[PDB]
């Protein structure tokens, strides 16, 4: 398996997003590309990364490998990589090893790191096809700020999806707080827009702890898509360029 990524800063961004939520996880390499799917320490939330081979330069995969990586380990190694560096994954089928090679732009420095793989009992989970009562698309940043701000009011947030806009509310010791995101009538902020596909109205409750973890992915995308129905796991999705996506799953009240 060999995979040359021009924009190396992605593999770096990905691993910051994940490492607060997952210690160790199984990368599933195939001709089609790189997939990953894990639950959190606490078995509360679920993350699924999907990076399609189309998005790499060199992509070659002979057999389907299932590499057990320690994400905290792999992050510390990836933090070495320059953000403008051309990153390449190489792994030799046999061996408990994954090679990350980093070429800098001057073409005159080249790092290469070998990290020790793990054997992982990957409890394979099966994420159903669902239609969704509501689906907000909004700026990753905006959503990030809301979750940070309301984390100061209380420990749960109440997302109310409606025809004309979305509301987020939280309460506690200090008081109460309501944040009302109206819909963008298109052609403004430039992309910095809020769009809604509301079939059935919803008011769901979620713990802000986990939302605030999921938002660590914010660097990957200027847009986040929240997708909801009564007592069915909310799906926070960050799309990765033209290459894949990252999806979080959290069960509501």
């Amino acid at each position: 398996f060999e995979a040359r990524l021009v924009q190396g800063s992605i593999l770096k961004k990905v691993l910051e997003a994940l490492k607060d939520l997952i210690n160790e996880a199984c990368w599933d390499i195939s001709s089609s590309g790189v997939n990953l799917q894990s639950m959190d320490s606490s078995h509360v939330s679920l993350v699924q990364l999907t990076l399609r081979s189309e998005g790499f330069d060199t992509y070659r995969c002979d057999r389907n490998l299932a590499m057990g990586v320690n994400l905290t380990s792999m992050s510390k190694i990836l933090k070495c990589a320059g953000n403008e560096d051309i990153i390449t994954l190489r792994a030799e089928d046999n061996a408990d090893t994954l090679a990350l090679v980093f070429e800098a732009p001057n073409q005159e420095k080249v790092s290469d790191y070998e990290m020790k793989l793990m054997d992982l009992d990957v409890e394979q989970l099966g994420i159903p096809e669902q239609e969704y009562s509501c689906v907000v698309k909004m700026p990753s940043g905006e959503f990030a700020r809301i979750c940070r701000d309301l984390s100061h009011i209380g420990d749960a947030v109440v997302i109310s999806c409606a025809k004309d806009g979305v509301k987020f509310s939280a309460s506690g010791e200090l008081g109460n707080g309501n944040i009302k995101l109206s819909q963008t009538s298109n052609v403004d902020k430039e992309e910095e827009a809020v769009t809604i596909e509301m079939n059935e109205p919803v008011q769901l409750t979620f713990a802000l702890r986990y939302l605030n973890f999921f938002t660590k992915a914010t660097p990957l995308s200027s847009t986040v898509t929240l997708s909801m129905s009564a007592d069915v796991p909310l799906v926070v999705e960050y799309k990765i360029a033209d290459m894949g996506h990252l999806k979080y799953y959290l069960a509501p009240k």
Binding site: H43, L125, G126, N212, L250, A251, K253
Partner: peptide, 19 residues
């Protein structure tokens, strides 16, 4: 951000998904 806890009333993702 203020350090949060996980509500007692949280369900596991196990009760929604499986193999």
């Amino acid at each position: 951000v203020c350090v949060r806890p996980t509500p007692k009333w949280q369900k596991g993702i196990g009760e929604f998904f499986r193999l």
